[PDB]
Amino acid sequence: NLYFQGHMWVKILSVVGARPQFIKAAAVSRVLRASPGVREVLVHTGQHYDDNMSQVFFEELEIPDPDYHLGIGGGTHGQNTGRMLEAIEGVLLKEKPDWVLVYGNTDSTLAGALAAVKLHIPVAHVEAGLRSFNRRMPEEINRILTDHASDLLFAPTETAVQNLLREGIPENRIHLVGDVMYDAALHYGAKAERKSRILERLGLQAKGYVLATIHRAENTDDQERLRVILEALAEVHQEVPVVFPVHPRTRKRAEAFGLGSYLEKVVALEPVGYLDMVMLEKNARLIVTDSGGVQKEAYFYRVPCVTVREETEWVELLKAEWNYLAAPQNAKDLALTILHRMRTKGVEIDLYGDGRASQKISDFLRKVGIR
Amino acid sequence: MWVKILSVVGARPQFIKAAAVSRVLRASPGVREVLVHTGQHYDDNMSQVFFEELEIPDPDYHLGIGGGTHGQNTGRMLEAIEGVLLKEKPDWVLVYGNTDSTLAGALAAVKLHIPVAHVEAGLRSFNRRMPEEINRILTDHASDLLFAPTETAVQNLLREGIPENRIHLVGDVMYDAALHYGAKAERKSRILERLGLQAKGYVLATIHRAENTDDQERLRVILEALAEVHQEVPVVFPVHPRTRKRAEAFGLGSYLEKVVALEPVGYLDMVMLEKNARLIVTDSGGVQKEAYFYRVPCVTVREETEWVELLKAEWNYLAAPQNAKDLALTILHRMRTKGVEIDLYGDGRASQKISDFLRK
Ligand SMILES: CC(=O)N[C@H]1[C@@H](OP(=O)(O)OP(=O)(O)OC[C@H]2O[C@@H](n3ccc(=O)[nH]c3=O)[C@H](O)[C@@H]2O)O[C@H](C(=O)O)[C@@H](O)[C@@H]1NC(C)=O
Ligand SMILES: CC(=O)N[C@H]1[C@@H](OP(=O)(O)OP(=O)(O)OC[C@H]2O[C@@H](n3ccc(=O)[nH]c3=O)[C@H](O)[C@@H]2O)O[C@H](C(=O)O)[C@@H](O)[C@@H]1NC(C)=O
Ligand SMILES: CC(=O)N[C@H]1[C@@H](OP(=O)(O)OP(=O)(O)OC[C@H]2O[C@@H](n3ccc(=O)[nH]c3=O)[C@H](O)[C@@H]2O)O[C@H](CO)[C@@H](O)[C@@H]1O
Ligand SMILES: CC(=O)N[C@H]1[C@@H](OP(=O)(O)OP(=O)(O)OC[C@H]2O[C@@H](n3ccc(=O)[nH]c3=O)[C@H](O)[C@@H]2O)O[C@H](CO)[C@@H](O)[C@@H]1O
Ligand SMILES: [Cl-]
Ligand SMILES: [Cl-]
């Protein structure tokens, strides 16, 4: 035996529930699965369950079948989170992992953190420390409580680091690693370029359209806010075609509120896969969204962005002038704002790291040691 | 115009706090209170006895959730509490202390955008293994109003970036309760008579922290320490059912027969035992304050406490359970001590301060 023979396994269990969590997990899981002395276990809470919200990401992003599908979703915050909490705990007692990874800030994120910390299993938070400072948002609650329940905090931004320090989280548990969604954009771009012909199937050409997505509860749960958004987009479409993959939350609200006819006024799609989405974003003249990740991706592709919200967690994008908030207060103004910004670019700047946040995270999990 | 306050209570120390605050809210103009009992504590001697002897109004809801894991108790409470909130739509949800019930109620509420107010906010053990440290950090960070009992708790909240306009130093509602119920206790408690004890003729012990009961070696040290003490001065020991169950589980039941072990007692009986003890040994949060209220020296069987002013003032002493004999001696040696004269925890109107803030 010449070389040193290591005898130590760590079991890392990831908890995912929703579309953006599968994307982040695809970047991180792949590095962990390739890491010596790492056994990864993946739990799918069931929060997102339609194939174009879940299965399609497992296919295109090459994620192994979850070890557990919990089958929980569609309910209230109370039912989803409550049921996930108890179910995730069951798994934890079975699998007895050394670390629990949770991602972003869905109800699934919070359920996993809570299930784990009370069993004294160390929680690590991928995308830690983002603040909208708007507690009406369920996502803000989620990230605050998850962060304060975590033993490791993988911040993507300096602002995120500052947020955590300001809430008394000790500096030694915080690591600025950048953003794994940039890793993912880099890792899957060639496959998107190879495999999507969404542009060919919509008869669209590069820079000849605007891409839009809207699903924030505060935008969809209010009939008249939603109307401002659908009406604005419809106005924009007369000037530049608007492509709009429509989230199931958004469709369900549009329907119940009777606003369905507005979707005839733009190029509305079922929700798309990541590969088609990359191609759509890459080639847009402008992106209008209330998504977190999409704001970032627009910048990756150096496409201008409008965020239809009263705030963003991703403030560096505003400072760099790649992003611009426009709250949905009236349709005329929203539309005018969109058309004006279609002519803009931000400044050249390198945000979100080197595309290897996944490797940093894996390295930090493996070397923390038994406290 | 009128204001609706829904209160969530699960366990014994929450009933006691609720009693103080309830009496004042109910009596207050422009206020309905709805009371939700999660079911976390359910034995008659941990729950009904408090409603009855403290004349707490019947809970509008009894969820009947208890006896399971953290994840079962909390996740079920979360769903069940939310259901009631959807029905009642209060202006404020009120939580107390730091049980699994506390967290479920806060979390149920904040996702419905109902303002949450934390009664007894900002206490910190800095021991993140305690399920109660997590409960309070998360509850505090989910709350809109923070009723701190001490300057330390104010400081703890500011250091975690919680804004000062949300923090009110109101003292301790458990002081209110002690003052209000003191006379009834005097009139109605016959527990000294029943147990054959004389005033200042025994030590009072309670023990129930998870780190003391789930850990066999810690639990053994404690029970062994108390049995040694009892040889010198009788030890009176109302045993938390968790503690009873863990002691039976680890085969330490016999130590309970070597002191004056009791089932858990009512508040009135407890006040009488506390008042008349030579010294109190506990790992309870509330009992360490109460010993101070009755100028009875306290020994706290833990590595830390949230109530650090009780150490500062020499009314309370830490004794971690490392060694049965070291613990027995520390207990016996603290018996004839006393702390300095100082007023902690306010004027006994913490509840009315609380009530005023809510109405305004
Ligand atoms: C506002 C907010 O809190 N957001 C949180 C939220 O994410 P988010 O708002 O980005 O959700 P979302 O837009 O559904 O997904 C985008 C992805 O879908 C792809 N995407 C989008 C549409 C589509 O049809 N196809 C497709 O592939 C896009 O290419 C893109 O890769 O949940 C996340 C999570 O917990 O992990 C948190 O990290 C977020 N926190 C932050 C701060 O961004
Ligand atoms: C350490 C810890 O986290 N503790 C938290 C915990 O309380 P605690 O540890 O005091 O539990 P506990 O000792 O059963 O009750 C004592 C009462 O029972 C009475 N008591 C006691 C024994 C008895 O037989 N009869 C009786 O009437 C006594 O007279 C006394 O009035 O739950 C509380 C809650 O969530 O509201 C938190 O505020 C506490 N946080 C703090 C910081 O003290
Ligand atoms: C509270 C929470 O965790 N919110 C997140 C959730 O929003 P999202 O709106 O998806 O939140 P939910 O998981 O509660 O789903 C809401 C509703 O969408 C419908 N539905 C959802 C999924 C599905 O596959 N099919 C379906 O029809 C159901 O009616 C369901 O009740 O995921 C988004 C990513 O896309 C995130 O940006 C949001 O932060
Ligand atoms: C996690 C949590 O919230 N812990 C609190 C809980 O501890 P406590 O130890 O009561 O915590 P639980 O509510 O989880 O109860 C633990 C176990 O005690 C037994 N049991 C409980 C209640 C009852 O009426 N009968 C019975 O037998 C059950 O086996 C139960 O499973 O209440 C204490 C008040 O006394 C508080 O100091 C603790 O902070
Ligand atoms: Cl979307
Ligand atoms: Cl007890």
Numbering used by the authors:
A (entry chain B): -6 to 364
B (entry chain A): 1 to 360
What does the article say, verbatim?
Given the unexpected presence of UDP-GlcNAc in structure 4, we next conducted crystallization trials that included both UDP-GlcNAc3NAcA and UDP-GlcNAc. Crystals were obtained at pH 9.0 (structure 6) and pH 6.0 (structure 7). Both models at pH 9.0 and 6.0 were determined to 2.2 Å resolution and refined to overall R-factors of 19.4% and 17.5%, respectively. Regardless of pH, each subunit of the dimer contained both UDP-GlcNAc3NAcA in the active site and UDP-GlcNAc in the auxiliary binding pocket.
The final step in the pathway is catalyzed by a 2-epimerase, which utilizes UDP-2,3-diacetamido-2,3-dideoxy-d-glucuronic acid as its substrate. The focus of this investigation is on the ORF WP_011172736, which we demonstrate encodes for a 2-epimerase. We have also demonstrated that the T. thermophilus enzyme is allosterically regulated by UDP-GlcNAc. Whereas the sugar 2-epimerases that function on UDP-GlcNAc have been the focus of past biochemical and structural analyses, this is the first detailed investigation of a 2-epimerase that specifically utilizes UDP-2,3-diacetamido-2,3-dideoxy-d-glucuronic acid as its substrate.
